[PDB]
Design a protein around this motif. Structure first.
Motif, mmCIF file in Angstrom:
data_model
loop_
_atom_site.group_PDB
_atom_site.id
_atom_site.type_symbol
_atom_site.label_atom_id
_atom_site.label_comp_id
_atom_site.label_asym_id
_atom_site.label_seq_id
_atom_site.Cartn_x
_atom_site.Cartn_y
_atom_site.Cartn_z
ATOM 1 N N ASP A 162 0.864 -1.161 0.000
ATOM 2 C CA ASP A 162 0.000 0.000 0.000
ATOM 3 C C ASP A 162 0.910 1.222 0.000
ATOM 4 O O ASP A 162 1.336 1.673 1.054
ATOM 5 C CB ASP A 162 -0.865 -0.021 1.263
ATOM 6 C CG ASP A 162 -1.973 1.021 1.231
ATOM 7 O OD1 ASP A 162 -1.824 2.012 0.501
ATOM 8 O OD2 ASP A 162 -2.977 0.852 1.958
ATOM 9 N N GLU A 163 1.250 1.717 -1.188
ATOM 10 C CA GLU A 163 2.172 2.840 -1.318
ATOM 11 C C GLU A 163 1.754 4.085 -0.536
ATOM 12 O O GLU A 163 2.596 4.704 0.125
ATOM 13 C CB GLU A 163 2.396 3.197 -2.789
ATOM 14 C CG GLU A 163 3.051 2.088 -3.602
ATOM 15 C CD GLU A 163 3.375 2.524 -5.020
ATOM 16 O OE1 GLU A 163 3.180 3.717 -5.325
ATOM 17 O OE2 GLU A 163 3.827 1.681 -5.828
ATOM 18 N N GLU A 164 0.476 4.468 -0.603
ATOM 19 C CA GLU A 164 0.054 5.662 0.116
ATOM 20 C C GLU A 164 0.277 5.492 1.603
ATOM 21 O O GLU A 164 0.715 6.427 2.280
ATOM 22 C CB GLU A 164 -1.421 5.980 -0.121
ATOM 23 C CG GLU A 164 -1.765 6.448 -1.508
ATOM 24 C CD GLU A 164 -3.262 6.336 -1.764
ATOM 25 O OE1 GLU A 164 -3.932 7.379 -1.951
ATOM 26 O OE2 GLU A 164 -3.775 5.191 -1.752
ATOM 27 N N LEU A 165 -0.051 4.310 2.120
ATOM 28 C CA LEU A 165 0.172 4.038 3.533
ATOM 29 C C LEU A 165 1.671 4.047 3.862
ATOM 30 O O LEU A 165 2.080 4.584 4.885
ATOM 31 C CB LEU A 165 -0.417 2.684 3.950
ATOM 32 C CG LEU A 165 -0.206 2.303 5.418
ATOM 33 C CD1 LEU A 165 -0.920 3.261 6.337
ATOM 34 C CD2 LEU A 165 -0.693 0.873 5.686
ATOM 35 N N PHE A 167 4.132 5.636 2.368
ATOM 36 C CA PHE A 167 4.714 6.975 2.315
ATOM 37 C C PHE A 167 4.201 7.848 3.456
ATOM 38 O O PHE A 167 4.919 8.712 3.968
ATOM 39 C CB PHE A 167 4.495 7.614 0.939
ATOM 40 C CG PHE A 167 5.252 6.925 -0.158
ATOM 41 C CD1 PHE A 167 6.554 6.489 0.063
ATOM 42 C CD2 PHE A 167 4.680 6.710 -1.396
ATOM 43 C CE1 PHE A 167 7.273 5.853 -0.936
ATOM 44 C CE2 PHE A 167 5.394 6.065 -2.405
ATOM 45 C CZ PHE A 167 6.689 5.640 -2.173
ATOM 46 N N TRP A 168 2.968 7.601 3.878
ATOM 47 C CA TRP A 168 2.436 8.251 5.073
ATOM 48 C C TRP A 168 3.233 7.899 6.331
ATOM 49 O O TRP A 168 3.579 8.781 7.126
ATOM 50 C CB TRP A 168 0.958 7.914 5.298
ATOM 51 C CG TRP A 168 0.459 8.541 6.545
ATOM 52 C CD1 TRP A 168 0.187 9.878 6.742
ATOM 53 C CD2 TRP A 168 0.202 7.888 7.797
ATOM 54 N NE1 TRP A 168 -0.218 10.083 8.040
ATOM 55 C CE2 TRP A 168 -0.223 8.893 8.697
ATOM 56 C CE3 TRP A 168 0.285 6.567 8.232
ATOM 57 C CZ2 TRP A 168 -0.571 8.591 10.021
ATOM 58 C CZ3 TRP A 168 -0.057 6.281 9.542
ATOM 59 C CH2 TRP A 168 -0.484 7.290 10.420
ATOM 60 N N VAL A 199 8.897 4.749 -8.523
ATOM 61 C CA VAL A 199 8.218 5.485 -7.457
ATOM 62 C C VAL A 199 9.135 5.739 -6.252
ATOM 63 O O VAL A 199 9.010 6.758 -5.567
ATOM 64 C CB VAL A 199 6.925 4.765 -7.005
ATOM 65 C CG1 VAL A 199 7.262 3.530 -6.190
ATOM 66 C CG2 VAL A 199 6.043 5.704 -6.205
ATOM 67 N N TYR A 203 10.297 9.359 -4.907
ATOM 68 C CA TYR A 203 10.027 9.702 -3.517
ATOM 69 C C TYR A 203 11.295 10.212 -2.836
ATOM 70 O O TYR A 203 11.278 11.231 -2.151
ATOM 71 C CB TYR A 203 9.448 8.526 -2.733
ATOM 72 C CG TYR A 203 9.157 8.901 -1.301
ATOM 73 C CD1 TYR A 203 8.016 9.619 -0.974
ATOM 74 C CD2 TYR A 203 10.044 8.596 -0.286
ATOM 75 C CE1 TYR A 203 7.755 9.986 0.328
ATOM 76 C CE2 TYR A 203 9.788 8.972 1.016
ATOM 77 C CZ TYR A 203 8.645 9.659 1.317
ATOM 78 O OH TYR A 203 8.382 10.021 2.613
ATOM 79 N N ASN A 207 11.369 14.250 -1.469
ATOM 80 C CA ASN A 207 10.897 14.338 -0.086
ATOM 81 C C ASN A 207 12.044 14.339 0.903
ATOM 82 O O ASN A 207 13.087 13.763 0.638
ATOM 83 C CB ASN A 207 9.944 13.191 0.244
ATOM 84 C CG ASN A 207 8.681 13.241 -0.593
ATOM 85 O OD1 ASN A 207 7.686 13.844 -0.194
ATOM 86 N ND2 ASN A 207 8.732 12.645 -1.776
#
Length: 225
Positions: A162-165, A167-168, A199, A203, A207
DNA sequence: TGGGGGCTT
DNA sequence: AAAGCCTCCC
């Protein structure tokens, strides 16, 4: 107290090897005493004790693991983890608190990394609703080993990441000054890059992260960009 | 930096 | 079981 544990303790001790203990102990920066028993011997010795006492009932497994965790020498925690793997099918979401305890006791990368991506990674896959009950809590705990657990639970997910998770979670810990957090961030990114290098490259470039983390993250892919 | 006896497949 | 890989380490 448990006969299985005490038998394992006497067996292991009789087969200790001071010459191997020194380098093993130094590898872990001397945080632990070692008997000097490497993996093939350690598992054989465990096997011996199992042949004699047989594997204890599943309702006893936690007591045995806790008693092993309390013993001074590191191999006993390594053996506890071998044992936990044998009971893998009986470990479920009701055992998360037990696993949290193992993570925050006798803590170092060797035990924590053996608990997190395998046991916890499988558990959250099977019980998706529990992620929010645990991960934000681990991040906010300021226990660096729970924080490492939140970063690494998806380590082996590959295409299930789960990429969004991910990176969060990283964004929440990007300012941590802790060596093992900066390392965990670099590791998960490096590992995920074997699946989705583009990705991860983006990132890392775009970031904020500790230089240590950036270096760890791209060590295998920088040759491609 | 970037590769390594002990470990894994 | 021959051979690749490394969490970490330096």
């Amino acid at each position: 107290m448990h006969p299985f544990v005490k038998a394992l303790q006497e067996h292991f001790t009789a087969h200790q090897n001071p010459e191997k203990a020194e380098p093993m102990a130094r590898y872990m920066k001397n945080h632990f005493l070692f008997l000097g028993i490497q993996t093939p011997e350690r598992r054989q010795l465990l096997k011996d004790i199992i042949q004699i006492h047989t594997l204890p009932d599943q309702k006893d497994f936690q007591i045995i693991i806790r008693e092993l965790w309390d013993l001074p020498e590191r191999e006993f925690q390594a053996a506890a983890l071998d044992i936990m793997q044998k009971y893998k099918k009986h470990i479920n979401e009701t055992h998360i608190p037990f696993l949290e305890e193992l993570i925050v006791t006798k803590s170092w990368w060797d035990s924590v990394d053996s608990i997190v991506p395998t046991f916890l990674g499988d558990i959250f896959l099977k019980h998706p609703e529990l992620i929010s009950a645990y991960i934000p809590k681990w991040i906010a705990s300021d226990n660096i080993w729970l924080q490492r657990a939140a970063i690494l639970f998806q380590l082996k997910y590959k295409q299930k990441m789960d990429e969004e998770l991910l990176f969060w979670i990283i964004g929440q810990l990007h300012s941590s000054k802790e060596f093992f957090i900066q390392k965990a961030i670099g590791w998960v990114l490096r590992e995920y890059a074997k699946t989705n290098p583009d990705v991860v490259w983006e990132y890392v470039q775009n970031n904020e992260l500790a230089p240590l983390s950036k270096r760890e993250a791209i060590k295998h892919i920088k040759q491609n960009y």
